[PDB]
């Protein structure tokens, strides 16, 4: 064939830290469908937002919003435990159906997005150009959010390890962990990946007794 219908830009959802996670890649022939499992960002999270985006940028905010919906009634559980299946299905007429279903509760929500939605030919071309021109910057942003989430994972696992130990962890150790946790908290608000990792390192260097418990 010399011609066919494609979806012209990547389609995905916003994930923790403001990154766009792609479900359908740009130039995929239509009709198409793809599903991926997602989980919750925080402990005890009973609801998630499914924000549908079109574009090639790593920052969710730089892509075109197509719509959004909430999925509630998730049983409060530790982060990463819920299994939320997100499905993108584009029919032959370019109509996009997005659904999210929580495996444990069976709760499901969906949205229909018209074929005329999103970016026009000129905006599609500008999207592709802007993504290529910002390839390195977008990669650095993705690496920063990965470290910010990891830094928050180290902050989460440390604080949980402190509470379980309680009286067992010495004073000199606990107070120095607390000060290293705040230095990590402050660096996480910044955009310097190495600064965050150095604060994580400084935390680990004062958590030696905490790890043994």
């Amino acid at each position: 064939v010399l011609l066919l219908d494609v979806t012209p830009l990547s389609l995905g959802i916003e994930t923790m830290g403001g990154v766009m996670t792609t479900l359908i890649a740009k130039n995929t022939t239509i009709p198409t469908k793809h599903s991926q499992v997602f989980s919750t960002a925080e402990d005890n999270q009973s609801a998630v937002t499914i924000h549908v985006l079109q574009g090639e940028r790593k920052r969710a905010a730089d892509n075109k919003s197509l719509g959004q919906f909430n999925l509630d009634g998730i049983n409060p559980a530790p982060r990463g435990m819920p299994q939320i299946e997100v499905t993108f299905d584009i029919d032959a007429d370019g109509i996009l159906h997005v659904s999210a279903k929580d495996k444990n509760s069976g709760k499901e929500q969906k949205i229909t997005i018209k074929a005329s939605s999103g970016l026009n030919e000129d905006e599609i071309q500008k999207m592709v150009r802007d993504a290529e021109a910002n390839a390195e910057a977008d990669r650095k942003f993705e690496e920063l959010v990965q470290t910010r989430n990891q830094g928050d994972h180290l902050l989460h696992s440390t604080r949980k390890q402190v509470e379980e130990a309680g009286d067992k962890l010495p004073a000199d150790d606990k107070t120095a962990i607390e000060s290293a946790l705040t230095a990590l908290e402050t660096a996480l608000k910044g955009e310097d990946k190495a600064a965050i990792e150095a604060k994580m390192q400084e935390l680990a260097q004062v958590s030696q007794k905490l790890m043994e418990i």
Partner: peptide, 9 residues
């Protein structure tokens, strides 16, 4: 690892 989602507004 499955990617993670934020809670509504």
């Amino acid at each position: 690892r499955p990617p993670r989602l934020p809670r509504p507004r």
